[PDB]
Amino acid sequence: XTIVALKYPGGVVMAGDRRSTQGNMISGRDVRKVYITDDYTATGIAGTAAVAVEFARLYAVELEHYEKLEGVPLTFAGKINRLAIMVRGNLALALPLLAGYDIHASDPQSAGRIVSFDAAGGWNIEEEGYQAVGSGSLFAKSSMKKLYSQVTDGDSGLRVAVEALYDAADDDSATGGPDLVRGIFPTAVIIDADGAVDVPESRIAELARAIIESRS
């Protein structure tokens, strides 16, 4: 599977594929791996439906718990710190990709954030614009390397994310491509100054259709 994340000016986009495999067998075609965790954050795990949703739920509970107790949300650095503590506690497996928007950053155009976790459970704030996790991550990253220059706003960012997932599926059998027969497409979350929103499936469908028609 593959989860992608990219920063655009004023925002961040995170996209995940829908497949789950058991060896060579397709066990899921509808897996949702990307979830909004708070008004300004989303997590994506390149694992099973359960691991992705359970991790996101516990993280979302922890963020809101702090907010109700203290009256104010954690700063972005604090959100990363709670996530890292949660990840290291589960290790002592698939690692999360956090996408967020720092509402307290000085420059709103570059307030988008992408945070990844290495095998040992260490965090890294990505400074190169995009990142990807999972079995098709290298294919997705190498695709974004060539297409990132086109990312000038949120829409073009969503388009590129979809095309990176498409490239991951085109070279990694463990990542699912857009399924036109069943109407199943990658899921995505967009986060900007107005918050984290689920991207409508109809919007991802048209982007996938345009990518296909273009390569045809």
Binding site: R57, L58, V61, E64, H65, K68, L69, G71
Partner: protein
């Protein structure tokens, strides 16, 4: 001293501490529940979110009710995670507070000088009448259908609401009816106001502060 007595010494100890503190009013309106409290402080809150449709308000000694506020949030979050978010309800939380206050009143050296209000509004797109509970220092729980008044001199404020309470009154109307009663027994500098807005998709608690509150007063 004797046991009948002890319990009396405690009621007074508690009733006096609550009578000495500022007042709070919680009332049912059209869009949900409205909380209004006399609060000069900008950081020490008497009104708070507990869970998605459930709110909290208290009067008395801060350190004591904030400890209960925290305890309620801990209980609600644990319950919602172990069961489902719908398990958390006003009545449920109002019973937990009754057990907790009741145990404090009996097993701890000093009863809590607090009076608590737990309110609940309907889930989005549902029609259920707002529920208001009053939990007192001894663990007594009362189901009030229209309003709850806590702290200070309660009797004159309650009567002033009876004269000016209207069911299904708009936000602006409900606020004025509430501010008037507190006054009977005050602007943006000395008030904490919040609503449990039934029209919110998940989280009903909303604070009405600054210019937006002025624009309603």
């Amino acid at each position: 001293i004797s046991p009948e007595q002890a319990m009396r010494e405690r009621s007074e100890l508690a009733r006096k501490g609550i009578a000495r503190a500022k007042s709070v009013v919680a009332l049912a309106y059209a869009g949900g529940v409205l909380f209004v409290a006399e609060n000069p402080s900008r950081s020490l809150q008497k009104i708070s979110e507990l869970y998605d449709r459930v709110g909290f308000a208290a009067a008395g000694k801060f350190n004591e009710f904030d400890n209960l506020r925290r305890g309620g949030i801990q209980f609600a979050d644990t319950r919602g995670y172990a069961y489902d978010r719908r398990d958390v309800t006003g009545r449920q939380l109002a019973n937990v507070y009754a057990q907790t206050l009741g145990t404090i009143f009996t097993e701890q050296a000093k009863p809590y000088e607090v009076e608590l209000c737990v309110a609940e509004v309907a889930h989005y797109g549902e029609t259920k009448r707002p529920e208001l509970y009053r939990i007192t220092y001894d663990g007594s729980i009362a189901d009030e259908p229209h309003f709850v008044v806590m702290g200070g001199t309660t009797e004159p404020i309650a009567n002033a609401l009876k004269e000016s309470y209207a069911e299904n009154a708009s936000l602006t109307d409900a606020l004025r009816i509430a501010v008037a009663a507190l006054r009977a027994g005050l602007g943006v500098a000395s008030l904490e106001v919040a609503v449990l807005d039934a029209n919110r998709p998940r989280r009903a608690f909303r604070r009405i502060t600054g210019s937006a509150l002025q624009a309603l007063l």
